[PDB]
């Protein structure tokens, strides 16, 4: 039977908006017919509904703004696999690196002519707009402070001026990537998701489909000093989930919090005191910290590894990242006792 899921982190919930996921082989025409049936049956009960978006490409389904009262009815619709209430996510050369983040300063000296701004924009209203993304674009491909200087980047805006996005917005962004690729294929794709929300079944499934479709995904483990498995896309298995370490080989402390850890973390990378492009001026640099910065280093290492070995499967690329990582340098004593064995003591490194 069809199931209902809502974010366990109650303040991150976005009630009134639902991702209705249909069974794996549901056609687009069927997804539209199921949306219309929901609108029609909902209308009979005096409820007004809006279909905001219809999914096709990775995951069939639709985004509906409606009253939660209609969920039992919606769960009985044929082709329905599960429904998820929307929730918030937050900022944490032959290869194309996609960035799903805030707006970016594309003319910054550091990334000028290496980053292409797509027309994609899906952000919630607000409760410096480009600080988070610009710095990250710079960490991946910046002329002076970048990891993969020769990498070209395509950016999508899924985070607003406060670094706040939605799971629905992120799904649409991930679908935009798959669509662009089918319309105009190129070489290997690296998808950088320097964001995180609570555990999400739909977001993990979208990441899993993109991964099984041959696209490489790199994500932030999260800055909640918690187990990365309770956050998304961090928890998605086939994704490369990156924790943050500092110059002293210490897991990063971010105030009362810090880097996430556990079995869902694939490896760690530098994520404290990271110099990179400051969106304050065209030649401005600033130091930043977070699993976003750590993930950006891994997206750069992976871009260079895939450029050297373009035939690497997602699994072969994973084995190369582990094999080339520095072993057992991280202070395990910073992690909770039971997590020390579960957390891989790996610090990302380029092949020598």
């Amino acid at each position: 039977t069809a199931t209902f899921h809502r974010c366990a982190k109650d303040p991150w919930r976005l009630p009134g908006t639902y991702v209705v996921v249909l069974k794996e082989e549901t056609h687009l025409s069927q997804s539209e017919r199921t949306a219309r049936r929901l609108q029609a049956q909902a209308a009979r009960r005096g409820y007004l509904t809006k279909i905001l978006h219809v999914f096709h490409g990775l995951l069939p389904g639709f985004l509906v703004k409606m009253s939660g009262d209609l969920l039992e009815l919606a769960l009985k619709l044929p082709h329905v696999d599960y429904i998820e209430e929307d929730s918030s996510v937050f900022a944490q050369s032959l290869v194309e690196v996609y960035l799903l983040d805030t707006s970016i300063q594309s003319d910054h000296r550091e990334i000028e002519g290496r980053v292409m701004v797509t027309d994609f924009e899906n952000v919630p209203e607000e409760d410096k707009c480009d600080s988070h993304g610009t710095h990250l674009a710079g960490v991946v491909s910046g002329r002076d402070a970048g990891v993969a200087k020769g990498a070209s980047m395509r950016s999508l805006r899924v985070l607003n001026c406060q670094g706040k996005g939605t799971v629905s917005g992120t799904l649409i962004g991930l679908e935009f990537i798959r669509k662009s690729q089918l319309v105009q294929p190129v070489g290997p794709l690296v998808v950088l998701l320097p964001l995180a929300g609570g555990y999400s079944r739909v977001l993990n499934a979208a990441c899993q489909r993109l991964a099984r479709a041959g696209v490489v995904l790199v994500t932030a483990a999260g800055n909640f000093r918690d187990d990365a498995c309770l956050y998304s896309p961090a928890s998605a298995p086939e994704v490369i989930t990156v924790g943050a370490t500092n110059a002293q080989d210490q897991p990063v402390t971010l105030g009362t919090l810090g880097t996430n850890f556990g079995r869902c973390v694939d490896l760690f990378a530098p994520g404290e005191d990271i110099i990179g492009a400051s969106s304050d001026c065209s030649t401005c640099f600033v130091s930043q910290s977070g699993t976003s910065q750590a993930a950006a280093h891994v997206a750069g290492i992976a871009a260079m590894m895939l450029s050297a070995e373009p035939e690497l499967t997602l699994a072969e690329l994973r084995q190369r990242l582990i094999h080339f990582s520095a072993k057992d340098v991280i202070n395990e004593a910073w992690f909770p006792e039971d997590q020390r064995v579960l957390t891989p003591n790996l610090v990302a490194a380029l092949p020598p």
């Binding site: 990891v147 530098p270 110099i275 640099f285």
Partner: peptide, 24 residues
């Protein structure tokens, strides 16, 4: 501390992180 040029950051401090990942 926001620096208005690369040289200004270099004088203030070869970033540790690019060294750590073996890029240098």
């Amino acid at each position: 501390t926001v620096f208005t040029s690369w040289e200004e950051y270099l004088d203030w401090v070869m970033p540790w992180n690019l060294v750590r990942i073996g890029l240098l």
